[PDB]
Design a protein around this ligand. Structure first.
Ligand SMILES: Cc1ncc(C[n+]2c([C@](O)(CO)[C@@H](O)[C@H](O)COP(=O)(O)O)sc(CCOP(=O)(O)OP(=O)(O)O)c2C)c(N)n1
Ligand SMILES: Cc1ncc(C[n+]2c([C@](O)(CO)[C@@H](O)[C@H](O)COP(=O)(O)O)sc(CCOP(=O)(O)OP(=O)(O)O)c2C)c(N)n1
Ligand SMILES: [Ca+2]
Ligand SMILES: [Ca+2]
Lengths: 675, 675
C-alpha cells in the first residue's frame, strides 16, 4: 500500500539523515513513523503558508526525534529539502540536531529540553480556545484548529509536564490531542528501573480522556480512529497511548542502544531490503509517496482558500472585529495604543513598581485585546489582574469563560513559562505575560531560556525583586537572578525605578516581536524621580542627573536609583559632585548607538554601580561595583538595607573611596574594549 | 483535655508570633496544629541532640507555615525559646520568616520555596533506607526511623513534587509518611480556580498508600491511627489526606485572607476566649502542656540512651562496620582516602573530563562508603556509575537493593537536586552526587540555590559543558549557566581542564561539609597539561605557565586552558610572551590569601580571560574577556569552535589587541578594588 510505503520512506529518511551526520537519534523516529504518517494525514496545514492562523499545530516534544519531523516536512513540501536532510546536524544547516522555530520551517516551537513541547502545546491550545471565543460567530468558525503533540517517557518524567497536564485538564482543553510514545525505553534502559507509575491512571486523575493503541507499530487505522474519538470529547484533552517498539525494524529494536546513536550500516541495509527499498540507496523518496502527500496538501490549500473567503465575509458582517483580527494577523498593535500608558511627575506620590505595573495593565488591557496573562498563584501579590476582567476558564465551571483574559496558573512557574511560549507561538500578535516573584522565575529557567532562543515576546511580571521584600527572608530574596537572565542572550531584563520607567518597560515588552522580557518589580514604595520619562527610559539607560563637572557617576537600577540620588546629596556635603545614570534595561541600552552609550557613560570619570544584587555583569558599565553577593535576611526591609550599608551614607562612602582610588589615574569609559 | 490545651497553645503561639511581627502566615498553622501535635507525639527525637542519627525526621514543606514549626520546637525545649518567637521575622532572629537549617535548631532543611520539602523528605527517606540496609544486622536495628512531611496544595502543584513522588513510589519508600493539608485554599482563592485534579488518584498511580482523615480539625485519634496504618505498609510511601479548615477558629477561617497576613486584634481575642485562654495575654505556655511534652521528651531520651548502648554492642559484635559507622557519625572521611584519587602526567593520553570523572568515581566509591549518587537518565552519557556497583532499588523489584549505591533518578533533574539535599540532610557524612548535562542543571535551579543557602555538600556531575558537545546544538549548549551558579553565594563551580584538575575537583567536592559543588565536565577529549597537579589545582586558581617577562597573562578554565597554551605558542611567533593561569574553581580561588591570589594575577600585566561561555564574572580576574555571549550551533564541535574563533590564532589575535590596548597605560591587578 502507499501508506505502508510512506511509513517506510519516513523511517528510512530519518535513519539515513542520522547515518549521514554520524550523529543523532534513530529510535523514536522508527517507532513513531506510523503515528506521524496518520496524524499528518488528519492535520490541516499549508506547507506554502506556515502562518495560516487556522492550521492544526504539531509539536514534537521529544525533540531528539527531530529526524522524524524533518522527514515529514520534506515529504510535504515545506521549505526544507532532501538536500537539507543530508546536512542534518551540520553547521549552518536548516536541520539542526533539535528543532528550532527560528531556523526550521514548520517547527512551531524549539524542543530538545524534555517536557517543554507538551507544555507549549497546552499554550497553543489555550491560545486557540481564547482566540476562538473572542472571534468566532454563528456561521463563522474563524478558529477551530487542533493541537497535536508527540511526547515520550522523558517528557512524562519531567515535572513541568505534570504541571501543564494538571492545568490543561482543569481547563478542559478539548482541542489538545497528545500522543505518548509508550516504548518502555529511555537512556538508562528499561523504564522499569525508574518509571513504573501508572501513567494512564495519572492522566485520568487530571481529567484527561484516554485512548489506547496497543499496536502502534502497524495499526494506523486505530491511530486515525483515536484522533476521531478525541475530537468527539470536546471538554477534555486526550492522551493517546501509542504502544511502540523503539527502533522498530532495526536489529537493535527495543533497546536503549537504538535511542541515541547511528545504526550500523548492515542494520540499515536489512531495513531497506525488508521494506522493499534499495540497500545501496540513501534518501529515497518514492514518487507515489510524494503524490499521496501532495493530494493532502492540495486539499488543505483548498480548505485555506475557503477560510480566506470566510474571513472576507466575516469582515463584511463584523467590521470592527474583522479589522481587529486583520490588524493582529498583520502583526501590528493598535495605532497609538501607547497613549494609554500612564505618565507621572515628580509631584506624584511614591508607588511600588508592582502597583505601577497593575496600573499599566489596567490601562493597556482594554486598549490591546491581544494582551492576556496570569499569575502562578500570586495574583493579589504580583497585582497582575485588571479589575473587571474575566478569568480564562471553561464556562462549564462557572468561574470564567474561554473569552477571558486572566489565567490562574496555580503554583506552576515552569509550566507557566512554557505555556507562555506556546501562546506566543500561536501567533495572532498575542502579547502574553506571567506573574511570580522574581526569585521563583528561577523555577522556570528551562522555559525562560527557550523564550530567548525561540525569540518569543513573552513577559514575566517578576515582583518582590530584592531584599526590599523584607520579612519573607533569604529563600525569597533574589541575589543571582538578574545576572543569570542578563547573561542569557536575548533577554530584556527591565528593573524600572518609578512610574515613567515602568511605563517604558511595558512599552518595550508589548512592542516586542523577538525578545522576551522580565520586569523586575518592587514590593516596596519608590518615589517618582526628577528627570525620568518614558522617552528617556525607552533607551534602556539614560542620564538622570547630568553633572558637567562630575567627580563620579553613579549608575543604578530600580530601587537603587532613588538611593543614588540621595547619595548625590550626601556627596555634595563632602565636596564631591556626582551624576546619576538610570539603567532600567541593559539589553536595550546595549542596542543603542556607541555615541549614545558614551553620552551616558563617558570617558574621563569614575563610574560606580549600585544594585542590591549580584555584581556580575556590572563591569560592562562601571569601574567599581557596590552590590550584594551574599544571601539576604529575614527582617523589616529598611533594617536589611541598613545592615548591608545600602544607605545614602554607605553609597557615598564607597563613591568617595572610588574617587580616591582613581586620583592620578587615566580613566576611560567601561564601554571601551580591546576587541 | 491536655491534648486540646496543647493544640490551642500551638495555635495561639503561632498567631501571637505573626501578630508581634505584623507579618507572616497564620492560616496553615491554625489548620495543622492538631496534626502537628499528633505527629510530634509519635516522633522519636531529642531536643538536646538534634543530630541523633536514629531520630524520626520532620519536614515542613509548606514552609510559610513555620510559626507552627517554631511553636513545636519551643514547646518541646529545643534551643529555641518564647523570646525567640517574639522576634519572629525580625532581623538576626532564630525565627526567620521561612525555616533555615543553618539558623533554626530542629529545622532539618530550608523550606519556603514550594515543593522542595517533600522532595527533601524523599531524600531523607532514601538515605535512611540505604543506611539501614548498609548497617542493620539481626538484633541490631541501628536505623529504623521514619520521615514525616507536611505539605500543602502549592507543594502539590509544583512539578518538582510530582517528580519526587513518582520516584518515591517506584522506590517503595515505606518509611516516608506525608500529610497533605487539604484545605482547598491557596493565595488566588479556592483551589477550584486552578487545582481540580484528583490528587488521591494521582498518588495511587505512583504506588503510594492513602489514608484519609475527613475531620483533621479535631480528630487527632484518626491522625494517630493513620500513622499506625502507614507504618504497617512497609513497601509504599503513604499520603495522609488531612481535610482541614485554613485558619481554623478565626473569624476569617476558610478564606485566602487568613493564608498570609496577620489576624485582626479582635479575631485573636475571640480565639483566646473560646479556647479558654486570656485575651489580654500573648505567648502563653500552660505548664500542663510543657509537662506533657516533657514526658514524651524524657521517653525519647531513654530510647536514645538505649540506642547508644545498642551501638556500643554493635561495635563489639561487628568491629569493622562499627568503626566505619563511628567515623561517619564523627563527620570524618576515611584516613588518607584521597590516596585513591587518580594522578596523571603530561605523557598520558587525552581524556574527556566526563571520562576522568568516571575513573575517579571508580577509584573512590570502593574507598568511601558514604558516597552514593546517580543520574537523571544520563548514566551512559555522564559516566556516573562505577562498574560492579548495585543500583539502589527495593529488592522486591529484582533490579537492585537498598544497600545499592547508584540511583536511577529518571528524567527528573529538579527532584534529583532536592533529593540530594535530603540525602545530605540525613547526615552520617553522606557525600552524594547527581549527574545531568550542565545545561539541564538549570531545570533544578530551585533546589541548587537551596543547596547553597542550606550549606549542603552535594555534587552535580554536570557533563557536556559547552559548544564542545557539538551536534545536539544550542538547546543543549550552556552559555549563561556557569555565570548563574557562580553568582549564587556558596557554590563551588569546578571546570577542570585535565586529569589532575578533575581529581582536585573531586577532592574538594567530597571533603566539603558546607558548600555544594558543580563539576562542569566535557564531552570531548582534552590533553593532560604540563604543570597541572592535584596540589596546585586544589588552590582553585594557579599559575600553569609562569612567564617572568609576560606581556600578557591568559586566564582560562576547562577546555580553554589547552587552547590558551596553544595560543601562547602562536603569540611567541608574534614576539609576545604570555603566561597561563588555570582557574578551575573561582570560589576556592577567592578563598585563598590575598598574597596567593596576587601571585597568580599580579599587578603590571594585562590579563585576558578565555572561556567559551558568558563573560559575566570574569572581570574579577581579567582586564579583557574573550567569551561566548550568544547561543551556540548544531554541528561538529571543532567547526563550532572555528566559527566563533576559539582557536589558537583567534585567542592570539585578541591577546595581541589586549597588549596594544594597554600600551602606555598603568595596569593593576583585577583583584584590586576601591572598597
Ligand atoms: C531536560 C532534559 N534532560 C535530559 C535530557 C537528555 N536526554 C536526551 C538527549 O539530550 C537528546 O535530547 C540525549 O539523547 C543526548 O543527545 C545524548 O548525548 P550523547 O550522550 O550522545 O553525547 S533524550 C533523553 C531520554 C530519552 O527518553 P525518552 O523515553 O523520552 O525517549 P526515547 O523513547 O528513548 O526516544 C534524555 C534524558 C534532555 N534532552 N532534556
Ligand atoms: C516556588 C514558590 N512559588 C511561589 C511561592 C509563593 N507563595 C507563598 C509565599 O511566598 C510564602 O512562602 C507568599 O505567601 C508570600 O509570603 C506573599 O508575600 P506578600 O504578598 O505578603 O508580599 S505561599 C503560596 C501558596 C500557598 O498555598 P498552599 O495551599 O500551599 O498554602 P495554604 O494552605 O494557603 O497555607 C505561594 C504561591 C513560593 N513560596 N514558592
Ligand atoms: Ca521512551
Ligand atoms: Ca492550601
Amino acid at each position: 500500500s502507499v501508506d505502508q510505503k510512506a511509513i517506510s520512506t519516513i523511517r528510512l529518511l530519518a535513519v539515513d539523515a542520522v547515518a549521514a551526520a554520524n550523529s543523532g537519534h534513530p529510535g523514536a523516529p522508527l517507532g513513531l513513523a506510523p503515528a506521524a504518517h496518520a496524524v499528518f494525514k488528519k492535520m490541516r496545514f499549508n506547507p506554502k503558508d506556515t502562518k495560516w492562523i487556522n492550521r492544526d499545530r504539531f509539536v514534537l516534544s521529544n525533540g531528539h526525534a527531530c529526524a522524524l519531523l524533518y522527514s515529514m516536512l520534506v515529504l510535504y513540501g515545506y521549505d526544507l529539502t532532501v538536500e537539507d536532510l543530508k546536512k542534518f546536524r551540520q553547521l549552518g544547516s536548516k536541520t539542526p540536531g533539535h528543532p528550532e522555530n527560528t531556523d526550521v520551517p514548520g517547527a512551531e516551537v524549539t524542543t530538545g529540553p524534555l517536557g517543554q513541547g507538551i507544555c507549549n502545546g497546552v499554550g497553543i491550545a489555550l491560545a486557540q480556545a481564547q482566540f476562538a471565543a473572542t472571534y468566532n460567530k454563528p456561521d463563522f468558525p474563524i478558529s477551530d484548529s487542533y493541537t497535536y503533540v508527540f511526547l515520550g517517557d522523558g517528557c512524562l518524567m519531567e515535572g513541568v509536564s505534570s504541571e501543564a497536564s494538571s492545568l490543561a485538564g482543569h481547563l478542559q482543553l478539548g482541542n489538545l490531542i497528545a500522543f505518548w510514545d509508550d516504548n518502555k525505553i529511555s537512556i538508562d534502559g528499561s523504564t522499569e528501573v525508574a518509571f513504573t507509575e501508572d501513567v494512564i491512571a495519572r492522566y485520568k486523575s487530571y481529567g484527561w480522556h484516554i485512548v489506547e493503541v496497543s499496536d502502534a507499530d502497524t495499526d494506523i487505522t486505530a491511530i486515525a480512529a483515536a484522533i476521531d474519538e478525541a475530537k468527539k470529547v470536546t471538554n477534555k484533552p486526550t492522551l493517546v497511548r501509542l504502544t511502540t517498539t523503539i527502533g522498530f525494524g532495526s536489529l537493535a529494536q527495543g533497546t536503549h542502544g537504538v535511542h541515541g546513536a547511528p545504526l550500523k550500516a548492515d542494520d540499515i541495509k536489512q531495513l531497506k531490503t525488508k521494506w522493499g527499498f534499495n540497500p545501496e540507496e540513501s534518501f529515497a523518496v518514492p514518487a507515489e509517496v510524494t503524490a499521496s502527500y501532495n493530494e493532502h496538501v492540495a486539499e488543505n490549500q483548498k480548505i485555506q482558500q475557503q477560510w480566506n473567503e470566510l474571513f472576507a465575509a466575516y469582515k463584511q458582517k463584523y467590521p470592527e472585529l474583522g479589522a481587529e483580527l486583520q490588524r493582529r494577523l498583520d502583526g501590528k498593535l493598535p495605532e497609538n495604543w501607547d497613549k494609554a500608558l500612564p505618565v507621572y511627575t515628580p509631584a506624584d506620590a511614591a508607588v511600588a513598581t508592582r502597583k505601577l505595573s497593575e496600573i499599566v495593565l489596567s490601562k493597556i488591557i482594554p486598549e490591546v485585546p491581544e494582551i492576556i496573562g496570569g499569575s502562578a498563584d500570586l495574583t493579589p501579590s504580583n497585582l497582575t489582574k485588571a479589575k473587571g476582567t474575566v478569568d480564562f476558564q471553561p464556562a462549564a465551571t462557572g468561574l470564567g469563560d474561554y473569552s477571558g483574559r486572566y489565567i490562574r496558573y496555580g503554583v506552576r512557574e515552569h509550566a507557566m513559562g512554557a505555556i507562555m511560549n506556546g501562546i506566543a507561538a500561536f501567533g495572532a500578535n498575542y502579547k502574553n505575560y506571567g506573574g511570580t516573584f522574581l526569585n521563583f522565575v528561577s523555577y522556570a529557567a528551562g522555559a525562560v531560556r527557550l523564550s530567548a532562543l525561540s525569540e518569543f515576546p513573552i513577559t514575566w511580571v517578576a515582583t518582590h525583586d530584592s531584599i526590599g521584600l523584607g520579612e519573607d527572608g533569604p529563600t525569597h530574596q533574589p541575589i543571582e537572578t538578574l545576572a543569570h537572565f542578563r547573561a542569557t542572550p536575548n533577554i530584556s531584563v527591565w528593573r524600572p525605578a518609578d512610574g515613567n520607567e515602568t511605563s517604558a518597560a511595558y512599552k518595550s515588552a508589548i512592542e516586542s516581536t523577538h525578545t522576551p522580557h522580565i520586569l523586575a518589580l518592587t514590593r516596596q514604595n519608590l518615589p517618582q524621580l526628577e528627570g525620568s520619562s518614558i522617552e528617556k527610559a525607552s533607551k534602556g539607560g539614560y542620564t538622570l542627573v547630568q553633572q558637567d563637572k562630575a567627580d563620579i557617576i553613579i549608575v543604578a537600577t530600580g530601587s537603587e536609583v532613588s538611593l543614588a540620588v540621595d547619595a548625590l546629596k550626601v556627596l555634595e556635603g563632602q565636596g564631591i559632585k556626582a551624576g546619576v545614570v538610570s539603567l532600567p534595561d541593559q539589553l536595550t541600552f546595549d542596542k543603542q548607538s556607541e555615541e549614545y552609550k558614551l553620552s551616558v557613560l563617558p570617558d574621563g570619570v569614575p563610574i560606580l554601580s549600585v544594585e542590591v544584587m549580584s555584581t556580575f555583569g556590572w563591569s560592562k558599565y562601571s569601574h567599581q561595583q557596590f552590590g550584594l553577593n551574599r544571601f539576604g535576611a529575614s527582617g523589616k526591609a529598611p533594617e536589611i538595607f541598613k545592615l548591608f550599608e545600602f544607605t545614602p551614607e554607605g553609597v557615598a562612602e564607597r563613591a568617595a573611596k572610588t574617587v580616591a582610588f582613581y586620583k592620578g589615574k587615566d580613566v576611560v569609559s567601561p564601554l571601551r574594549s580591546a576587541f
